[PDB]
Design a protein around this ligand. Structure first.
Ligand code: VO4
Ligand code: VO4
Length: 230
């Protein structure tokens, strides 16, 4: 039997400002920092430890991991930072206030952009400042694989290779794994692990900075999962 622990980044500046974020590299608020620290103390107090961690290339997730590591005295463990764990790419909605967007385009249209499994938001223009092509984080990713927008289906397809190629072999080797990532990248993983349908997964909400523990059997099939804390 294996345990795998998941955590969404703490409150980001754009969570506070009610903006779609996607791949824009915004940082944690003081409240986000505190959530991250609290998650680390909770894992420490429950006697959890880790051998390795995976995270995105986005600093809200990485700094969340840093706080967890600091509180746990695990600053020395290997960390794999992967663009494959990045939040779902929100296209031309990245940076827009969610309430002002629904006001302009209507709740129905925004429902689609937030919840349609297979239909992405409107794309960035290739020359947008927010496009990923000149970013050193993605310099070794083939240009064709870099998104200008994503539906959750795209996000799942992008995350799973990291699981197959690295995380699953890590777990099977008896490494105690922590994944510090984002709402939709974690939903993508949870969808695969729990075999959740296209329709069901769209309604799963993961709170900021709460450890989510998965117990897996010999075939990496979930036995049970649960949040730690209150
Ligand atoms: O801006 V979202 O919390 O619907 O990924
Ligand atoms: O505000 V998010 O990258 O789960």
């Amino acid at each position: 039997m294996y345990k795998l622990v998941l955590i969404r980044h703490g409150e980001s500046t754009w969570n506070k400002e009610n903006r779609f974020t996607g791949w824009v590299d915004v940082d944690l608020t003081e409240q986000g920092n505190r959530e991250a620290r609290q998650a680390g103390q909770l894992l420490k107090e429950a006697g959890y430890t880790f051998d390795i961690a995976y995270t995105s290339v986005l600093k809200r997730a990485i700094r969340t991991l840093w706080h967890v590591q600091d509180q746990m005295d695990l600053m020395y463990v290997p960390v794999v930072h992967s663009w494959r764990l990045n939040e779902r790419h929100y296209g031309a909605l990245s940076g827009l206030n969610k309430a002002e967007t629904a006001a302009k385009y209507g709740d129905e249209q925004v429902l689609v952009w937030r919840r349609s499994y297979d239909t992405p938001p409107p794309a960035l223009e290739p020359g947008d400042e927010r496009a990923p092509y000149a970013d050193p984080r993605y310099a070794k990713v083939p240009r064709e694989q870099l998104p200008l927008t994503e539906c959750l289906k795209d996000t799942v397809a992008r995350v799973l290779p990291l699981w197959n190629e690295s995380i699953a072999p890590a777990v099977k080797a008896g490494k105690q794994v922590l994944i510090a990532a984002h709402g939709n990248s974690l939903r993508a993983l949870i969808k695969y692990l729990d075999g959740i349908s296209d329709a069901d997964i769209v309604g799963l909400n993961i709170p900021n900075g709460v450890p989510l523990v998965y117990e897996l059997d010999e075939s990496l099939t979930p036995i049970r999962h649960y949040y730690l804390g209150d």
